[PDB]
Amino acid sequence: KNLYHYHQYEITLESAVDSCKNHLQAAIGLLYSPQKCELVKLDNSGKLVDSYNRLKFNNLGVFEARFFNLNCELRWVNESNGNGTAVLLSESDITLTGFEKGLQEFITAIDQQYLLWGEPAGWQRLAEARIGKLDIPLDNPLKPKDRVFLTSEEYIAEVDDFGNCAVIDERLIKLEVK
Template identity: 35%
Template sequence: MSTRLYTYRRVGLSLQEASRAFAAVAEPLPAIAILYTPEKCYLVRFTEGQFMNAQGQPLDISRVYEARIFNENAELRWLNDPSPAHCHQTVLLAESDIGDKLGDVWQNDSRPIVATLSQTYLLWGQGTGGTYNGWSTLAMARVGALQVPVPNVPDKANVLLHSIEYLEERDYGNVVVFDERLIGLKMDSQSEEPN
């Protein structure tokens, strides 16, 4: 287990520039991105510097106002600043010192951790059994259909978003979660078996 969480910050990068920095530290592992636009939340693959949708086409990122790109190596968080100053906020998190891959224009910090906790979040919808090109469809009457970059999700199965919570010791010996890093999407092994 790592004993530190490394955080790198930079202001003013576009999403495309920030994603290039992520690619430099996160590869060779594949990555997933959660992209928020005013109209929709997208789950996409991040491959070779491109955000690819379920049809294998690059996604237009011009309306994205928040992004999280992640894999087991690192997570990038990006927040759009719509003001004329374009002070977009970019943060990279990793359990290893990745500063040499980023250069010295990034503000960096590292914090000691006392422990980590694995965490999962259930995505809305259940598998429909439909799979295409390494993607599966989750659906639920209340929310409709959602394409997820997880292959072969069977009918009625669930998909989980996995993360790691980082714990540090504070005043008087109290231990708190001070940050969380997304690491991947996987099918829930405890999902209800199809009938």
């Protein structure tokens, strides 16, 4: 089994997402900025409703971003003045322009979960007295006893030539209600 990962360097976040848009369809995304950690959803075409002004770096702009859906995850992090490295992670071999392909073999993928902050207060709201509110891109409404989880897959592979396994990556998949 192969984990395919695609690198492009010296690329802005706005351009990195636009390069991946065919794959980041409907993808949830998390944007790290000096003052906010905002959750965003790309539309079915993989576009953001204010992508330039949201993804720019110039003024307390996004320095790191993640976007994920079922099939793939895009990661980006700033390296100089708003240019960065993009890495897209995919289960399947796919065509991208400018990106360089690579892969790593993995022994098995194991699912994980991550409970989000808050109880239920398209878009839904969780809230917790500890943090106040958290808004999540989630289309179905939430019953008062629901909790929203985030799912991921960890890929185990041999690191050492002595055969020692480790989880070489963890790709995010989707938000899920449990």
